[PDB]
Amino acid sequence: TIRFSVDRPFHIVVRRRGAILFLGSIADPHDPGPA
């Protein structure tokens, strides 16, 4: 029911078992192409 549009600078936290594996602040998305 809630819209979450990540259409401006955002932050991302990749984590596992209490540790932050990757921490990023993304401002200009570069497309790697479809998976």
Partner: protein, 320 residues
Amino acid sequence: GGFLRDDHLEFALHLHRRLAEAVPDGEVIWSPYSVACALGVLAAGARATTRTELTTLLGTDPAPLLAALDRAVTDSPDLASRTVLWVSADVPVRSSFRATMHDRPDSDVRTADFRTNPEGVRATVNADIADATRGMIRELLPQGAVTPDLRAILTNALWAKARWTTPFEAHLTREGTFRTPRGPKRVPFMHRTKTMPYATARGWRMVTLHAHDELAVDVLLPPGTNAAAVPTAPLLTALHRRSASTSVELALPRFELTQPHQLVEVLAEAGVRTLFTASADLSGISTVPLYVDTVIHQARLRVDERGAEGAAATAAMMLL
């Protein structure tokens, strides 16, 4: 409570804030795990003020932190870590430090001939990092990074491939507008509507993407009143605590970012200074006095319809 070890989260967002404030577009990608592992291992070999500065930045002595970090990267084929100490034959490594190295996952202590074969060492180290990162980081050490005067290099490499438990449908990815610091740009947005964790606090909004093997990915949007805001530890913890099941129509850009870093300057501003001078006390590593000249760090993260795959590596270069 928070899903992250408290002192580690504080450490991470402390440095993250400094990194974000140093770039013109606020864009940053790094691995707190990798940097913390390297700093923790160094702290395990450090004495007096050199050690206290490191423990203050990490918010804890190395032992409990390294044990926690080790557990975070073991037991799954979706991630792997490797820590290695490359050392000159002129530097005898203390047995206790060797023990610290061996406690780390897929660890090793290797001999390196910095004096007569610096390029050979750079090639060997870069190849080892490339192997550990599944080819995602092929040149951690730039040309000229390894000089004949170095006597030791401590490296940590990380590779992790999170697989969304519910992948984004490929045919649903379409172009949309993303407002970058350099203006509006048309980019591909992945779309998925599904129940997932959602939280709001102090104007911030966050969702969490569920992945296999205990991996999770939080995505945070700052308040529209300050699109450049950076999260703090108390804030993320509050978001984790308030996170609740919510049907969310999610639009997330497909993206990939790689960034190389030289961390001595920011680490010094963060409080770690003696370690980078001849006054450093690393007598827990060797009877031969060493200090850190530079700290190299490279990170790469790709987010697409199938998951999030990243790699990172850290190298602490030491001189006599």
